[PDB]
Amino acid sequence: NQFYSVEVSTFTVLKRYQNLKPIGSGAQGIVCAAYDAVLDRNVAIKKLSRPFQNQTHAKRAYRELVLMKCVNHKNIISLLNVFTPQKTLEEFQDVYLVMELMDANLCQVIQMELDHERMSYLLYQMLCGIKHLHSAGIIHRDLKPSNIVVKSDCTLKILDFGLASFMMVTRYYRAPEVILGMGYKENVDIWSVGCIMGEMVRHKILFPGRDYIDQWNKVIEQLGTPCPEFMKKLQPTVRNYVENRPKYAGLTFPKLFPDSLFPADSEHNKLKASQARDLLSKMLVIDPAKRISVDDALQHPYINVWYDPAEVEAPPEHTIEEWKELIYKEVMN
Numbered sequence: 407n408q409f410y411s412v413e414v415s416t417f418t419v420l421k422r423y424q425n426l427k428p429i430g431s432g433a434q435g436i437v438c439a440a441y442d443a444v445l446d447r448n449v450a451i452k453k454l455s456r457p458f459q460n461q462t463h464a465k466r467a468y469r470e471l472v473l474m475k476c477v478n479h480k481n482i483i484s485l486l487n488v489f490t491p492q493k494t495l496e497e498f499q500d501v502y503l504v505m506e507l508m509d510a511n512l513c514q515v516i517q518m519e520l521d522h523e524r525m526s527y528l529l530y531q532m533l534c535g536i537k538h539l540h541s542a543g544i545i546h547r548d549l550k551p552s553n554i555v556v557k558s559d560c561t562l563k564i565l566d567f568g569l570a571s572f573m574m575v576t577r578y579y580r581a582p583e584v585i586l587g588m589g590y591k592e593n594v595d596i597w598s599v600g601c602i603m604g605e606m607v608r609h610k611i612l613f614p615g616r617d618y619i620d621q622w623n624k625v626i627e628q629l630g631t632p633c634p635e636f637m638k639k640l641q642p643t644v645r646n647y648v649e650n651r652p653k654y655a656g657l658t659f660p661k662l663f664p665d666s667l668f669p670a671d672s673e674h675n676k677l678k679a680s681q682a683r684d685l686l687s688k689m690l691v692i693d694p695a696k697r698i699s700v701d702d703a704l705q706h707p708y709i710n711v712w713y714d715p716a717e718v719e720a721p722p723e724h725t726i727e728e729w730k731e732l733i734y735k736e737v738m739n
């Protein structure tokens with residue numbers, strides 16, 4: 407047989423993949439690092455166990471398999487291989503996704519001190535990734551550091567495609583318009599970038615909460631109560647919940663993110679600190695009509711030192727049995 411099985415939970419993989427070591431584990435899959443003998447390099451292999459098992463797993467698994475082919479960008483996951491060990495639709499149980507092995511996820515990187523050259527490099531790439539997604543008609547809406555990976559050479563990839571409802575979820579990076587069920591447009595994703603950036607500086611999650619109720623409170627306690635023309639776009643029930651919580655002035659950006667947090671010894675670093683704080687103050691903006699756009703974020707001085715036309719301006723429900731077959735066929739391409 408082409409496949410062999412190992413306990414990791416059982417991984418049943420193609421024989422080219424050697425010496426599996428578990429490296430990750432979310433609701434969606436276990437991920438192993440492995441050596442790929444055919445390509446002569448290391449890969450990450452994610453097992454999606456019976457993903458047609460509910461609407462949630464199914465939609466995500468299915469959607470991300472289709473979207474794979476609609477993207478082609480170094481800052482967005484590319485698949486090396488897609489496979490199932492099972493040979494028939496009836497036997498079908500598991501999907502394995504193979505990609506390049508990176509060195510770390512953003513959670514890990516966030517915990518480090520990074521200079522501005524790196525910090526800004528990570529961010530330029532997130533924005534190039536997101537720019538790519540948007541040009542393909544994909545607004546992500548759920549960008550977060552545990553789905554973002556990095557290499558030692560500071561290169562970065564976004565691994566998932568976001569949102570499009572029960573099962574037996576980290577929300578901290580979601581935009582107000584997502585937190586409050588409003589219309590959104592492409593700059594919804596800018597907010598999540600500003601949350602990841604804030605976190606890189608502060609080393610704490612900007613807006614923690616048990617659910618959207620606490621989370622909103624952390625938003626307003628820091629950025630202050632939003633403005634009139636923001637309310638006008640809230641559904642009347644959310645509007646009135648939102649027009650009735652304790653108000654806040656909200657702290658300026660130098661209180662939010664003091665010099666203390668920034669590499670700021672040399673003149674170069676004092677200047678980069680000011681510019682990083684300028685971008686933060688432009689991205690973490692409650693009201694989307696006043697939030698910076700992806701293209702303006704890419705022209706910001708903190709980010710534009712990396713700018714490269716080639717990188718920036720580039721390419722482009724169901725029952726469980728219905729999902730099993732949709733996903734099977736996709737895997738079979």
Ligand SMILES: COc1ccc(Nc2ncc3nc(Nc4ccccc4F)n(C4CCCC4)c3n2)cc1
Pocket residue numbers: 429430431437450451452483503504505506507508509510511552553555565
């Ligand atoms: C020790 O802590 C780490 C963390 C990350 C790495 N490096 C690393 N590299 C590639 C990855 N691809 C995925 N997922 C994935 C997504 C879609 C298709 C296929 C996949 F495998 N992950 C998850 C593992 C946990 C973090 C993200 C990956 N992690 C190495 C070590």
